[PDB]
């Protein structure tokens, strides 16, 4: 292993591919350059808190197959990955602080069977040879596979996965994984869970007829068709832009509908991958704004199921919803048997 | 006050909100990070010339209500703000070098009544309690209010204001201010003035029928309808792209019309907020370019009034137009009683 | 806890003392400044690989009582300290990567009784209340005390200790500790050991009559008086400067004698605290030099005991000597029953 | 003015001398280089908080004649210098944040007669032509001269001054100045004052017979000869190294006597020029140490006068002594009519 | 070749030694670290203008045998070295900008026989096999050897050379070289030359009886013994400290004599190796100072020969003296047949 060999692979293979060779490398400030035909070409700018030459090596060795989105791994308590780097593209940094068998500066072990790895919840990838059996022996672990594992009940994960920073539902490649988890040598039954949909504002695409209806129909028409009167969708989902403080607007599909008609600014003041996102939102059309607007991307059909499964008889309470394998707390406010607002915290 | 408490407020409230608490903070190079669930998340990248921890505190304490655009405050001679930070989003830096009662590293005073503040033109905000009366006592000051001030004649400011970096005409919030100014204890009569419209190229929206006509009609049709023959609109407003040096094109609406049909590059080589902007422009379609193209965004109706109020009998002269409370100099070139060009300097 | 409060303590108490207060702080590049009467004064320059604000906090909280030299702790396998920072003054950095109950960015636990601390060999300091009993309960640990511990046999440590970076034999303060060690809940019997003396070239002071004799007597006289003929002291201790490659010179006292008569340069190319030190040495008088000259500071009486306890009948072999609780390997070369050279590796 | 012209003067004249010319300059990180015969030579490393090219210009234009030590100017309330830079060699930075007529980035005025300079206490140097008369007209100012000023009573300053960072009593050049001060146009009578002597530990030289006696005589002999029994010189001046906490040792001459016999470490944790200095002291011989040891360098004859002019009848009190034109507070502790300790704060 | 292999050699061999291996390396800012037993140890701090990883490689590959001082190579017009790095310890940087066969980022050729090397004056080292014959074939070159070269007349170089930054007259190693030079394929006759002695102030040691006499005798006694009256040694060599501007003092031995009696400060404002050095000198005893004091270190016997070989009949003139193979210009000032001053420029 060598910095110059890593650069050679990046230049010739697009990432670290284990090829032999070296190229000349310059490091100046926080950027790595290589000399290409007499001129310097930037290969990598370190945006991490690691040393530039270390971040470069971890970046070059990132996993380039579809992998679980980082929010899923965090929610499952994954501490470290077995013999790979999960690159966190939202943070432009490794998803995990340490490595196993990846890099001499960051390795805590060469193999996940060493004792130092035993207390950590290690992520194992059943697509790599041998890792399923390592999971059967590991004390703490999470395993994904594309198919069945003998003697283990799977929990079916989300349909989408991350490929080189692109979140997608795979058609030429499988992105739908079974999930398994062990704690202290004991296989866990992962809970029934909803999954977030991981869409974004500018390219929001509906994924069900109900979501199509939400984008196509007027507000009162949609709530009428699906008999959603009294659940405060006008506030919660569509948003209330009538006052200086922006009311509601907590579901991504609701932001998408407003955005497609009228633009607004979202300051992502904690920029990481998480099931619930908090934005400093400023509506450009009205001047309505809100410092902390919590936003979750559930499939609209799923959100309706959740809200229709709540008792509306109490002024305020916390509602727990298992999402992405974690319990998300929602604030439910009601008045006279109707929803006033309902937002994730 | 404390760096870690500022970070706590940013993480939990989107900005500094006076809440008690602390979170762990890392500073590496010119970026501030906080540790969130075992990983570092970037909270702020310093693009200012202040120390990173100082810029972070001023940024977190920026004013998040609608405030006058920085170009107005500069034109009014404002030196410093009373108990707030005006963040200059065009420069990504504070609009003013010093503060009053904001930050221990940058404070020159805790209250604007101290003698050190007397010679400075201090900006007071009548929406904050007590500040109107501070203005009545201050030696040098500018005061904005949303309504009347007893015994003071107001100057009506622009319709738009800046909210979290978004320039807008408020509908749910008031952005139209009265302006007052004192110099050496004496209230000034602010001059009659036009106002720039603060629009941008990509999202340019007409704001009058004349501007609608400009975008909808052909060049000769528009000049004919409003009887503008001989005022060189073909050159000044529409632009002349026939030669290697780009001719004219000095009004934003004229750039907008060309841009909507044909893209071009504008290098903003002095990136700050100012009434007149200078761009290094390169027309992609023709290759016509100009190193310094001065561009002003007046409402088209206002620009027509201005140019029709000039004598066209002289080869060249400087025309003074009060705009944004400042005197803008225009170059007027005429030949045989017609305009040849007319551009701001 | 807060950066500004740490700076307040540094300015007012010389280190972190738990006092309430704050001062204004600036961070620019890798240096921390505070404003003192209108000007900036540097408080700390980060020479560590930690973030500047983190290194500053660990530095301010360094232990300022006599503590074991870092080489002893390393040799004893200490991984982390209980509720203190051992500052490594040779590296100008913390001696240990993590902390317990010191600093939010670096803490792995608030108390050493947490499970995450169990596999680490934690250093406990019996001078601090409660820590002896924590040692009795800890799974892995090293404990120093100034006196007896009930039911535990002590190993008497070196006479000297480090106080604010000053290695000294205490007269007004106790620097002589008893040592105890536990591995997996079992108290260890620490081995019989020599100790290095931790002296330096420029201020080398003899500590026994034999060392006095070495500095005072001529080479042949000293070897004769203590009947050291055939042990190659002429080479090993005095040094051989007759060839382009410097021969021998492996004991600090031998460097001291040459240095007091004739100066030379020692490049400390791995600058850390360790029992054996390696120097790139250049003799200024002769031009004799050697890239790797291993140097150990044993009391001369101790080194004579060691070398007189070796068999000299073999051409070459590795000799193991327990020093500072670790086994130091020496290379022993002999010819015709006499030493040729003998140096630590 | 130009960066490259400044570098030309530095290379050819040792400082800025107003010569015409330019040399090639490179700025990389915080260091300025120039190319000299094909290689880069470092000219200046910025240790200030100013921009590297700005600090370089102020450094090159530093005053290279004898000037008052910075501690005197600070004590006199000087805010800024007229047409010069006082370089603060203890901080390796300008003594004053702003300049007058020195540097375009830092100038607040070109001449001290401008209104912006009126509220500042401006330092004027009577050796420069015209500055005495500027002082007669300035509202706030301090003036030094080498001789009489018509109609103004002088206060005789210290014998020593700073020349290129060297504090000296001039023999070939005059370092003894008259001082004058104006506040709001009114000449002040500067108070009777002692002066500190500005000596250092390693090169401490006695400057009176009493100081000679202190270094030459034994402790009891000296106190006896000058009849100083009961004034706790044994504690205050000689120092008490018998306990873990170092007792007393508050006069530089007392540190000098110990240091000449036995070395110790002084951590200067607030590194600036000031009348009273605070050190984190560790005595190497005994291990006695103290986190905050306040140290003042008075001429011993002066300190005896001060302490013999105090009432010793009270347990504890604050004693005010005018020194370097400022009031220094001393803590006086007495028991049964004798001094227990007496130290500056 | 590889960064990590270079670090391995540095850690294990003190410099680059061609050994196989790798160690983990971190680069942060301008410093290279390696992890040694769980902690980071600084290996190299870049003070050059090259990229940190490039400077590190050139530093590790520096020549560690005695080599000509850089001032000699510069004076001989050497542009580049054949298959080695001459490290310039005065500048802490490579003596030459480019390399031949050393480092991929800096190499301009792998062998000096390539056409790109033909116009450069390449330094060849006859101690390395094959390089003498390369010199016979090179178009432009300088060759040093320890002995005779067939068919070439040598010029005997200085007695001293640089070994790892230590300038010395070798006793165990040869530092006295023959010099040869070729320009456009033609061997040059190097001129008769004096050599500077390369001594320093603090450790100045006389090297002849005349120099011994200078240090031992009083000023008038020495000038009398060697009949030097009228050559202004009182001014030129001893220095004149009677006025605010320091007079004379242009020979290092003269600085040494003053320094041994009385200290002064020398600011080396162009820090590089050169035959003539310019210092900003401040005399601590008198306050006499001079911004540009040119200082040359000739053996006193040599300087007397030079000055006694000048005509003293003219007010002022430039005197050319071949020194270190270059022509040094001296200013000679005379009055009434005696020297007034005589200093190098
Ligand atoms: O985690 C949070 C906290 C607040 N809010 C929004 O901020 C306001 C909180 O009001 P209050 O409960 O502080 O009165 C509401 O508009 C709510 O939608 C969120 O979206 N998420
Ligand atoms: O402040 C300026 C200066 C120049 N120009 C443009 O640059 C050219 C100036 O020509 P001249 O007056 O230098 O000949 C014209 O095309 C004019 O529109 C501007 O827009 N603004
Ligand atoms: O760890 C080491 C390795 C080598 N040397 C010195 O370097 C030389 C090693 O020679 P060799 O055994 O490589 O032939 C000897 O002078 C020896 O003293 C040391 O001091 N320490
Ligand atoms: O400004 C200060 C404060 C304390 N000390 C020293 O620190 C100790 C203060 O003790 P106490 O008054 O806090 O008990 C004494 O040894 C005293 O000499 C100083 O020198 N200067
Ligand atoms: O290259 C130089 C230039 C000047 N000086 C010194 O500076 C002064 C130059 O005076 P002047 O010839 O500028 O009058 C003299 O003291 C002279 O010794 C040098 O040493 N070297």
Author numbering:
A (entry chain A), B (entry chain C), C (entry chain E), D (entry chain F), E (entry chain D): 1 to 345
Manuscript excerpt for this entry:
Here we present a cryo-EM-derived atomic model of the hexameric endonuclease Nsp15 from SARS-CoV-2. Biochemical experiments with recombinant Nsp15 have established that it preferentially cleaves RNA substrates 3′ of uridines, and therefore Nsp15 is commonly called endoU alluding to its cleavage specificity. Each Nsp15 protomer is composed of three domains including an N-terminal domain (ND) that is important for oligomerization, a variable middle domain (MD), and a C-terminal endonuclease (endoU) domain that shares homology with other endoU enzymes. More recent work suggests that rather than functioning in viral RNA synthesis, Nsp15 nuclease activity is important to evade activation of host immune responses.
We characterized SARS-CoV-2 Nsp15 bound to a UTP nucleotide by single particle cryo-EM. The cryo-EM reconstruction of wt-Nsp15 bound to UTP revealed a hexameric assembly containing six protomers of Nsp15 (designated as P1–P6) with D3 symmetry. While we used an excess of UTP when vitrifying Nsp15, we modeled uridine 5′-monophosphate (5′-UMP) into the active site because there was no observable density to account for the β- and γ-phosphates. We observed additional ambiguous density next to 5′-UMP, which was modeled as a phosphate ion (model 3′-PO4). The O2 and N3 positions of the uracil base are within hydrogen bonding distance of the S294 backbone N and side-chain OG atoms, respectively (bottom). Thus, our cryo-EM reconstruction, recent crystal structures, and previous biochemical work support a prominent role for S294 in uracil base discrimination within the Nsp15 active site. H250 and K290 are both within hydrogen bonding distance of the 2′OH of the ribose. The active site arrangement suggests that similar to RNase A, H250 functions as a general base to activate the 2′OH for nucleophilic attack, while K290 stabilizes the deprotonation of O2′.
